[PDB]
Symmetry: D2
């Protein structure tokens, strides 16, 4: 089965599984789980921050992050297509009583600071209270330019705004930068790390920031239902992935780039390729038919007028070649 | 004192006051106040709708309106510069647990239906549940084209979305249309009426829609703190304004149009005028200075790089001419 | 028409009306209404507090008050039968994201401090954050003992809790105390004043506390929809009532006490009488019939197995005597 | 290390671990994980209900449950000491916009229906809208009498109220009843199952009810952050526990009962024992000292004036005897 629906579909490797079953656990609510502590300590150190916490999903990681930054009546500026506004059911507004202020991102995935400044509300009773700027890196595969990350950092400091980045695929960005995570994370107050995607764990995300911030995050994680007990078995997979699965993300990027070439040669309208993602403009007429066509040959895609293809450790170039041939035959 | 800050600054006429003090009242919570009932019934009748309720402010009118349309987890599509998203402290999200979906309005004040359709969320657990489209008419004075109001009404029917319009200045649009309120209101499920602006009452707004909708709205008005007792004394001004102050809104429109002509001649950068509003592009350097200059001559404006001037029944053309002369002197 | 449903049914006197129509107004949002300012300044001075604001209803006064005291996730301890928990549709929870912690009040209308202390949550992620103690005075007519008001004040200070009192009928308490409002309000951080009841205005309530507190209250009043424009016409009635209608509340108390005597003589089960309220235990069998019986003779009551009778400036003893005679005939 | 803090501290057996690592997984968001589906289908089948969902915690299971039962402005009647009111940071009110109506439970852990009826709000705009009655079984170890569960189910039908039970320790009750889960679960619309306690899994709870209810619950689980991917590896432990660790809960009950007997003999004030829990009245002066005394001998308790001791598969009777000896020495 060839699955290009997302990098979320990754399955645990055997070495990862062996690490999961061998790890010492405890009750994380009591803070007694040594493996969860180790993962959190390692993630904080690796990113140059004071503290971190384990969460079941990236969705809760952002929900807890927004709650920890923004009070009732406060507002976060965010991308119209950003996950913690668009793809989390409006949790920040619905559950958190937080005003979302979405704006269109630039082509490079960046939220233009000139547009952000126009959205910063004056201290007047008619407006919500602008408190947070939320970024996404990578955003649909796109690696935000390093120069912007600095500019956004200084800007938020000058405007007394917090800066959070959704780093569900921040390690995809890191190897695209060719730098250390530390050199990127310095330009944010808090950020997330998804472990259950490209890094290939079955479950888990990380929220990392300063000590007092994370302390509040522990309260909100509890209320939202993320306070697990012996979650060290999951954290074990996270530790393994951070130490073994970061560098090999380059393979996913090369594969996606390779796949874009093959579909371009096959006559498909490849819109763009970024890291481990590639977007093909299939016909609205052809969308449903392509999905069914691929499904019949045991290839799984999310059928859509614009199809997103996502590479990961559970899809090789040999498998990509098979899909590309099916796509070619389809056209 | 010349006040061009807003039409909210309007004060009660002698006749409006005499109507307030003569009006029969009761406890509105028990529904025993004959004057607000009369106002609500009259507003519903005038708009071809089933029911209406009196509210203390237009802000609550919209807050209650969004609460009544959208459940927890549901979403309303709205303008980035629209009032019930931008100028009400985000109440719908903060108090109502409603996801806001703002989009840029077109130059004519309309929310382009092609972008609205792109913002309608699929029935998937990742998205909020799109339920409502909210419009604003007038929007910063701008009168929405009638053809769009029909198109938007039809569009929402096709997508099974509700349609609410912020009609704080809907009567300004009505006389600009030259039609009846009903002929505009037919293109929405619910809409608001502000009474405390151009119509010139001290307090009050109306929310009007169908019977079941308004019944839910009564529950939300109670929770938000708008369930008043003898508000008939306030409603009386509303009845008077609906019957006496609608036609003369043309005066405010002509004044704004005249002032725009006058300010252009005085050397000011007049950007646009729509109904009873006028927008001048003043220097950021000159913004604060102009305000202070005008304040020292008993003229009140909201000092800003872009100044919004709003005409109303408490500012005459003679007064506009006086202000225009001060503006001319300021630019010399 | 004789109306004993509530003191809310009071209608403006002519002198009050003449004051309403003569008062100077402005836009309160801009803070330009001199009459609203005068009322707020007078109420703050009279209560020994720094600031006050005008609101459309007592319900919003409490909703705004709870919002201004309690953040998202914080908790207020309150009576099970208290208005800002029971009779405001759960606004604090539904709109304000505030945990209510209701407890049974004592017979005297007091919330026992030993029970309050047991409800103060430890600083643990499993619990909401206890922040506020809310009192009600009067509570169903009952005047809370002065000694308790002090004890509750010291207790909340020692426990670092805020103390709010619903003073919708606090002036009924004041004349029952025979003291000044100032001597009662010293034992709270914030409190409310309803003007549209016994004081007899058509519309209005007041929220009064410290300067920073009220500043936050202005923001929440805006969001909740209480930011009126030329509300000076309503505030004018408030000023008149504070200066003319406080002392005469004694008449309402004497009338209610007199009425309790008459119904007791007529064979009705009068449960208790407090200030301008009295509660009669009519049959559940007789409840609907009594309501209809009184309605036919142009007497309005809230028909119920326990009927609450409320006196006010629009009901005299001559009218009370008529009702008592109807009640006597009914039995 | 002797841990009597809670049954949450249970660790995976070798066989449970081997089941986890052998289990087929997929993306649960896409619904492609065969093991959680198997667990959910099995839990629904076992309880005579239509559907079930896997959740990371019991807290989210209840939060999602209340969200799915009660809309914004609606109310759930619940115990003052109940978990989904007291021990979940008030999530239902804070996140869910749900009015909580707590009442004191009776000594037997039941919410007396006469007080419940007194808390059911009339359909009036002054009140929240009573919609749900939430129970807890077991409640601090206490097994709710079967007759009450039937009475409460019937009562809620008559009042058109929903009935949810917090069944974090429902299987402890089941073996205490000596009946089948179905025979208990029939008296509710929805209920929860914690897997990470007495059943001994590292992570997981279940929410089970009817198809439409659970479908709504899936939306709320997503928003609250419980929509995991390959959680089948976690669900595998749940399947193992349901099939192997239910009957042996009797062991925990006998242990707690034995410990209560043993501690009474040692001179401790044993207040009560119910299923796998035991409550001792220690001095407030001795509370902190006892904890430190036990901690220094590798015995973990939650030091408190009233100490809750909880037995589980990771504490033997031999270990209980050791602790009882330390307690005896402490009191001498
Ligand atoms: C940028 C980003 N942020 C947050 C999340 C949320 O992660 P969870 O699914 O673990 O909650 C996702 C997953 N989005 C779906 C996908 O890309 O396939 C994401 O892509
Ligand atoms: C279009 C619109 N809608 C709603 C409101 C809110 O009404 P209240 O302020 O009475 O709540 C206003 C007033 N907005 C401020 C102004 O234009 O001066 C408005 O202009
Ligand atoms: C103690 C108390 N507090 C607050 C309120 C709310 O006031 P509004 O009705 O102005 O919102 C009331 C009115 N309660 C209804 C009655 O006693 O008749 C009340 O009695
Ligand atoms: C009855 C009950 N319900 C729900 C929960 C919440 O489960 P999670 O902690 O897995 O979210 C607990 C655990 N309460 C803490 C204890 O008894 O140790 C509980 O005892």
């Amino acid at each position: 089965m060839i699955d290009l629906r997302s990098d979320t579909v990754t399955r645990p490797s055997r070495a990862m599984l062996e690490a999961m079953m061998a790890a010492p656990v405890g009750d994380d609510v009591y803070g007694d789980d040594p493996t969860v502590n180790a993962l959190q300590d390692y993630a904080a150190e690796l990113s140059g921050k004071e503290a971190a916490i384990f969460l079941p999903t990236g969705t809760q990681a952002n929900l807890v992050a927004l709650l920890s930054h923004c009070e009732r009546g406060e507002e976060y500026i965010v991308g119209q297509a950003a996950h913690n506004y668009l793809f989390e059911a409006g949790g920040a507004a619905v559950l958190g009583s937080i005003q979302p202020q979405p704006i269109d991102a630039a082509a490079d995935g960046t939220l233009p600071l000139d547009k952000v400044a126009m959205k910063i509300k004056p201290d007047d009773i008619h407006f919500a209270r602008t408190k947070l700027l939320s970024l996404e890196n990578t955003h649909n595969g796109k690696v935000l330019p390093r120069e912007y990350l600095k500019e956004a950092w200084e800007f938020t400091r000058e405007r007394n705004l917090a800066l959070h980045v959704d780093g569900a695929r921040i390690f995809n960005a890191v190897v695209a930068y060719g730098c250390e995570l530390k050199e990127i994370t310095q330009y944010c107050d808090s950020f997330t790390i998804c472990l259950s995607k490209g890094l290939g764990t079955p479950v888990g995300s990380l929220l990392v920031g300063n000590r007092d911030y994370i302390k509040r995050a522990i309260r909100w994680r509890k209320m939202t239902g993320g306070g697990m007990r012996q979650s060290g078995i999951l954290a074990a997979a996270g530790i393994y992935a951070l130490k073994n699965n970061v560098a090999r993300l380059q393979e996913d990027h090369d594969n996606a780039a390779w796949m874009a070439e093959q579909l371009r040669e096959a006559g498909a309208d490849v819109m763009r390729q970024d890291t481990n993602m590639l977007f093909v403009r299939v016909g609205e007429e052809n969308a449903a038919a392509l999905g069914e066509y691929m499904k019949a040959r045991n290839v799984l895609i999310n059928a859509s007028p614009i199809v997103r293809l996502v590479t990961h450790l559970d899809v090789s170039r040999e498998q990509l070649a098979e899909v590309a041939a099916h796509w070619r035959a389809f056209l």
